[PDB]
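task queued by scheduler; priority normal; single chain, no ligands, no partner chains; default sampling; output format set to structure tokens
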Amino acid sequence: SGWDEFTKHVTSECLGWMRQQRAEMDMVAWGVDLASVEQHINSHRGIHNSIGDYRWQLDKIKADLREKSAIYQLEEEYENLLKASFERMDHLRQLQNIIQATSREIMWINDCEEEELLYDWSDKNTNIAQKQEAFSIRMSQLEVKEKELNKLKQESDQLVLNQHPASDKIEAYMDTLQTQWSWILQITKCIDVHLKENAAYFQFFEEAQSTEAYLKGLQDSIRKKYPCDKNMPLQHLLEQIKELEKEREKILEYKRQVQNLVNKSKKIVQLKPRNPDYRSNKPIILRALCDYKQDQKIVHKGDECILKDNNERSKWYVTGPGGVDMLVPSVGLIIPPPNPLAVDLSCKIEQYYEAILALWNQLYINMKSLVSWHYCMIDIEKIRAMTIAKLKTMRQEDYMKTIADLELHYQEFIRNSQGSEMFGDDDKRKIQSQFTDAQKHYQTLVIQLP
């Protein structure tokens, strides 16, 4: 104001168009919807190339004017608009880049997640070998991603540092990325645990079913390898007993192998209930492998949950430990021991070991008694064959000892015969009579000496 009226018009119209352009490019809303960002890039490109062309329309106008301030004021407004126009074209660019990148980076993690989410960890999946390696490949792919992600955030923080008009909105998008990333690592942490427990689960039954087959087929093997009849020669017996004692040593090495299975069973996890079709009368107890949270509903690593519905092989309806029903991803839930299928097997296998141990005890004392029987008969023949004339040739302690031998060999027999199945009462009397006879046949010759 205060100038020529033609100058007040030409200058007003200019400042009016130059500021109506600022209004339009400030009334743009900042969003991460790539479809919007795209139309804003084209939109502004039309406004930028418009004011860029306006420099010449402005030159013509400054040439007609003569008012000192007017000219300066117009040039100052234009140079200000032009500067803002450039910085806008750049702010849009920077945005599109950072979002496109983060957008594709989220889909990558999501796809990784979708994969592990749909994986089958039941007993039907025995390939803890394929999985083990495929996983190590991914853990490498991931250590690779963390790099790409780290510098993607370093690119983002820079934009916030430069007060990008959309700072808050991109930090929010990055928040999303961070959330997905943290979750994929949680899955990997509990995938390492499935791999371990599932390995054990299969290792255990492979070893147990193989031990059970052994101790059951050994209960019959032995009984055939060591027959016990009353008509076996003395030599053969002593040699059988020696082998029979090597056997016990071996079945003591089993006790240690067996005791190991007893222990493992107490730690073997449950897999069958992971299948939607598995039915049981006892409720299924779960444990959380990692924190999972979905809007105000949160489960903590180590929380005990109850399974309600598992028709979905990726999402289970789960309750507890605060009576709170919630859908938590199957991946992050395991079914801890005790596994009744494992404990019962370890109990069974243990009873086979004990059966063998008992069988051994029977065969042992059986032979030990058959040996005392023979040792007794040798002494009985010595005493029976004793004549008064034959005695005088021998020392007075050669025969005094032969009865001592018999007395002791007969005690050993009575002792081993107690729990033996080799001698019925018919024989326990038969020998009892041979002994008592020979006993007096001796004291008949003990009195005749003087």
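post-processing summary
- Strands lie at 285-288, 292-294, 297-299, 304-309, 315-319, 326-329, 333-334.
- The chain has three domains: 1-225, 226-267+337-449, 268-336.
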